């Protein structure tokens, strides 16, 4: 699966449709980023710039100009071609090939941007710009507007209105197209395959990072070179740390391991969590906590549909959790009183669901307390968990247990589709999978 | 292999030994670095801060104070402990545990640095600071010195002399200790194992990135989670691009593949290049170029020793190259005239050798044209290559061939030790290794 | 004459009337300005901040909030009272006295602005801000908007639209109210008195700066402590330099002296130029150039009225000038051809007229080539001049002559009113005035 | 009096003498400074740049290069000549005329500084630079050093040591040469003439600013165009505000007026304070406070000499003050106990003496509590005062009285010379002077 030329074109048009007449929108590429000294991290394009271009170079700027309600055109600034820079650091699109390759009307050298950008904004009424996203962008934009402001004797005028395009663009990204869902579907499959492999490879005596290596190799073999976020492999008490990425410990027989990992496929994020016994067999105490988290996930997957909200499903999860914990003697008292006192918060201290897309924690307005009514095309995670601290004042057998189970879904017309159900989560199925692998 | 507490202590003392009396040296940690939106790249500590601390947190500053020629002490600023930040993002050293863990006299909260740093520099004559390394550091340091400058009514005075410690510290890093060599030795072994595996797995129809996945998995299984630089896998004409990292192409029977990859083990970089046929059998034309590059490497490995230089060995390599190319009809004319006209430069257009250590392109003064006389403890690469452009005006059979062969060495008392010789480079040995694997 | 409380109130309301509902306008005070080391120049408030407040302290910000089409309110941030800062640097308004004194609804400490401003902008749709006017303002505003942008979990939202209020406010300042005209009328009288005094005091052997001292003393005695711009006193060849402020030369019998000087009365600028003989008697050559400049001024004063433009009157001046110069043999050829070739530009190389108000070069849109149709209430200068370079290739007697004559006017319903006609400009009247004084 | 070419040359050499061999010192000119919109304050050169050049243009940089202990040379960067910029804003030195006019070896265009400065610092060991003085300077200097740091392949190296030249240069400025003393002597005379005139012109009903106008006119007529600081004219209760510059009040019969004003002559500051009755006749209550302040001044003028300190003389002044106040019933108790409790501080709350030179609050180290031993050539103020608040709990007749009397002196071999004694300070002499004038 991939995103077509035509889809990138549609997105630009959909933004232009919402822009005021006599305006220009400016979307900047991400800077390169130092890892150490002269070496750089692998390049990651800005998600919003990527969304309208599918162009993976730095030092580029998309300018969409709306002259009026039926006339508009696109200008790309990008790096000029250069034999020496390309023998070294690899090929560039340049200006000649860009109009056709990327479907833009004009392409200009990024090195000429300060000489050209103000001429493009001259006489417009509005400029859409994401101020404070990048410093190099703010410098370029403020420098253009100052030229126009001070150039009234050269008959130049600046647009007096500056509008943030992020709310508009993030509201667009919140609703996935059929193509986007097809890509995210494959990101979910790739990620599931990686998690199944981690379960099948796990043995006591391996280190947490060994499972990270297995996962990343699986991402890569399907053409997802990078993860969408830093992989979490928290065995034992490390599973009580929500974003544990040290992954430095020897995995011990008797412990659970919590794996939170997701690939990045064509820009889009997978995001799955699975928790399982290192030795392939859940203890009674481990099952008791795991069952509460699994019921939470399974109930949420039933409930999520158009018309409800993350807040409303979260409330049901809290009920399931508080009731389960009371039955184990981890909480004491009346369920409804405990719910009203948020007595689950020491054990479940994060949100159930976030938007998913070009970023793992994707853009889009949630509403107060995540009360926004869900609609078809919204893509989100379902990620209940329970984390009992090593020093919690609860029965000994629950102390130092961290369990999360997380799936990725898309809201459909009548309910939801689970993108990550191809990796098992029922305990009996986890155990069968690990036994099968240990034979072979 | 690892670096001991005592070794970190020795390094600090070695720097303090060179500092003026009545001075303080300020060494800042690296900032966290955004990959996209709220997600961050895996943290990489500043190599110089790492060198004196082996401490892998951001928002930390080492202050070494030399009161006089026998009195000095160390102060660490680091992140305070915090239960909520640690349930989320994982554990912190804090101030209580830091003196013992890191061998410093005092530890203070990074959040108090602007209230404390000027009190530490008050009345000193010199401050050692790497100006322009990090903006957040320059702001902290300039803000401290301004307080002191303007506080003469509170009996405060600023050191009038600011010295860059980088030349001193980089001259220290240039000469590896026995422990550093032991670590780099293991980085070389780990990297060699990865390159052997890539050769053994390569088949036509696999993609360049598939070999990247194999390599990274091998790094990880030996406890080197990250590469020291972005992995290069350039098959066919892609091998003519020196830092090709797209690794996006299907590998074709008939083509060579150039793999440039290195692990990062305990901070230290491996750096190996091997070029081999995708189908396991070099053609006559491929052998003809490969043999020139291999002779270049083998001769350089014989020559490198105390007393010579990168420049002097490079001159021998150029002779070997120009002579080989003339014999193939790729160059025409008198060898010595061609050498004097640098007629190899269209085909070999980079340096033979760089320093290697905590950075792949390691710190240390090279001298003019890399004429610095080599001494025991210097660690460096030997990396001859020949790159014939797809459109070079040479016999057809050499066009689009990129070959590099690179090993890592340390200068010893009587010659050099090859850290990366455990992966094969003689063509007959490459071919045997790939045939053996293809059986199985 | 002065500006009333009620007038400041009217101005704010007139701006609020034009603002969108659910918006806030932010108007910042000028920073203090170093002259040398710890000493500062006399404080000059930002003209726009002054316009809405008549408040002459630094570190102040006016926030006008339009909740909707009938509800709005004002908030002032200003310096808190402080006994020690006031024993030293003199009295402050503070927060208690500000609402009544300045007619604002609320007053808050400037030192709390970063804690309060974002709460004032929370949930608004638009913010009016003059971006790039002051750096300290941009930092305050961007810091507030970032808090709101990132505070969606605390139910905060930033206005997505930022609008420059300068075009609106400068269009307001362009049309003077009856009170403003009364003040500018007195600024013109004060300035005229100063220029008359300079003529009456001038003797050969005095220095240019001596006339500057006379002028400034006259400004001050009428309660205009500061000039509106740096005083020009260019005798002889110095009169060929348009903004000559060195005023360092001995004034010579035989030379003309050009005095360009203006007071600042209650914020408003006077701006007069008079040129006269140092010895009180114009030569034939001096009269010949002076008469052309005077006819230019006198014709322009007849012509300026609603319905015409600076461009249209400038064209008449150019005709008068080119014709006069041709008659003197300073230009050669056909008048209309010379006009079409802009042959006056070596001698008259600046505009005839600029807007006048709180700034000497006052705000307001001129239109292309200053073609904007004039309307009652516009206040402007009329300032023709001719400058013949010491090395111009013209008859010897005109070389090194600089003459400008400048008056300040306001456009009325049927023509214009001359605010600066109380200082003489007809040569016979200049000469009588200087003879009378010499007796003283 | 003026400062010779030779003296500027001597100063540069005296600095070069103290510089390390293989170093360059960088001294930047002051920026132009906005008063409002496009209008600028009168230009004031940086005192340190002025000290070595007597050059009064912006955008200039003096580079003094010490190659070794007998070889050094000077380079000026300054504005290029330009006919259009000079017809408008007046003449420029340029590069051709600068070597001779300013006694420098080479002059280069300021517009080429980023292309040339790094070539001047290449290969030096030390750079003397006043970091944080001006932002435009820090940008220029850091940009040069970065070029050198990163240009090792072009055989460039940066000086690793940066030293603040301000301590050295300010220690030079602290000791005035015979020429400097001659100029400061004339600044004292000019300032005294102005203060005598203010006394002679004062009548009840005049405003405070009227005396400011008289003073400034007197400065100007002697060729001191600008004051060295903003003039203070505090009548009545305004005299209790130390730096009262509003000067807005009608002067009332019965009140004292405190005038603090100083001219700037050839860069050097006069600084005199005189307090006198508005109506020409001191009351008993006014005399009682005035006599304490005058005894303080007269005793200090006797005491100041090489070997003592500002601290030591201040202690004598405090004794005189506490004793006087006790006799008036303004303080109660034992003199020595009151002195030990600093019981004078409500009434005398500033220092007695500051250094005087190119800045009114001149550069130079004071020592702890101003304990530095005085030496011939030091120039300083002597400025005791007593300020009784309108609401002080003291006998009614002393409330709202502000009196300061300040003279400028230079330490000589055997004592001091009073530069400002030509304006009267004994009350009987003040009264005679005002009576004489009233006849005018
Ligand atoms: Mg347990
Ligand atoms: Mg071929
Ligand atoms: Mg003449
Ligand atoms: Mg009284
Ligand atoms: Mn997750
Ligand atoms: Mn998630
Ligand atoms: Mn390599
Ligand atoms: Mn290498
Ligand atoms: Mn004028
Ligand atoms: Mn004017
Ligand atoms: Mn004073
Ligand atoms: Mn003083």
Curated annotation (Swiss-Prot), chains A, B, C, D:
Keywords from the named record: Aminopeptidase, Cytoplasm, Hydrolase, Manganese, Metal-binding, Metalloprotease, Protease
Swiss-Prot/TrEMBL cofactor(s): Mn(2+)
Binding locations of Mn(2+) 2: 260, 271, 406
Disulfide bonds: none
Coiled coil: none
Entry EC number(s): 3.4.11.9
Molecular functions per Gene Ontology: aminopeptidase activity; identical protein binding; manganese ion binding; metalloaminopeptidase activity; metalloexopeptidase activity
Enzymatic class: hydrolase
Cellular component aspect of the GO annotation: cytosol; protein-containing complex
Catalysed reaction, written as an equation: Release of any N-terminal amino acid, including proline, that is linked to proline, even from a dipeptide or tripeptide
Biological process (GO), any one: protein homotetramerization
Annotated compartments: Cytoplasm
Main location: cytoplasm
Family assignment from sequence similarity: Belongs to the peptidase M24B family.
Known partners and oligomeric status: Homotetramer.
Name of protein: Xaa-Pro aminopeptidase
Species for this entry: Escherichia coli (strain K12)
Gene this chain is encoded by: pepP
């Amino acid at each position: 699966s991939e995103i077509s030329r035509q889809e990138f074109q549609r997105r630009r048009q959909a933004l232009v449709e919402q822009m005021q007449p006599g305006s220009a929108a400016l979307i900047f590429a991400a800077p390169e980023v130092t890892r150490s000294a002269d070496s750089e991290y692998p390049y990651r394009q800005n998600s919003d710039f990527w969304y309208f271009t599918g162009f993976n170079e730095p030092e580029a700027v998309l300018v969409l100009i709306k002259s009026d309600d039926t006339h508009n055109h696109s200008v790309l600034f990008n790096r000029v071609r250069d034999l020496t820079a390309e023998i070294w650091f690899g090929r560039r699109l340049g200006q000649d090939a860009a109009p056709e390759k990327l479907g833009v009307d004009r392409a200009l050298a990024f090195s000429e941007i300060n000489q050209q950008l103000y001429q493009l904004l001259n006489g417009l009424d509005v400029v859409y710009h994401a101020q404070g996203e990048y410093a190099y962008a703010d410098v370029i934009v403020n420098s253009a507007l100052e030229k126009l402001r001070k150039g009234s004797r050269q008959n130049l005028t600046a647009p007096a209105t500056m509008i943030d395009w992020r709310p508009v663009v993030h509201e667009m990204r919140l609703f996935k197209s059929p193509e986007e869902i097809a890509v995210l579907r494959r990101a979910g499959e790739i990620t599931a395959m990686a998690h199944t492999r981690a379960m099948e490879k796990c043995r006591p005596g391996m280190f947490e990072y060994h499972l990270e290596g297995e996962i990343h190799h699986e991402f890569n073999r399907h053409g997802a070179r990078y993860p969408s976020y830093n992989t979490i492999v928290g065995s034992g008490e490390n599973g009580c740390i929500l974003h544990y990425t040290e992954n430095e410990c020897e995995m011990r027989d008797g412990d659970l391991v919590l794996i939170d990992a997701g690939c990045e496929y064509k820009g889009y994020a997978g995001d799955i969590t699975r928790t399982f016994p290192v030795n392939g067999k859940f203890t009674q105490a481990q099952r008791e906590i795991y069952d509460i988290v699994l019921e939470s996930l399974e109930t949420s997957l039933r409930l999520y549909r158009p018309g409800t909200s993350i807040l409303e499903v979260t409330g049901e999860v809290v009920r399931i959790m508080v009731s389960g914990l009371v039955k184990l003697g981890i909480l004491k008292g009346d369920v409804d009183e405990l719910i009203a006192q948020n007595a689950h918060r020491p054990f479940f201290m994060h949100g159930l669901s976030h938007w998913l897309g070009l970023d793992v924690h994707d853009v889009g307005v949630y509403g107060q307390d995540r009360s926004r009514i869900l609609e078809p095309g919204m893509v989100l995670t379902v990620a209940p968990g329970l984390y009992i601290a090593p020093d919690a004042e609860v029965p000994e057998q629950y102390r130092g247990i961290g369990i999360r189970i997380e799936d990725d879904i898309v809201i459909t017309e009548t309910g939801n589709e689970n993108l990550t159900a191809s990796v098992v989560k029922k305990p009996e199925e986890i155990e069968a999978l690990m036994v099968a692998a240990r034979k072979q």
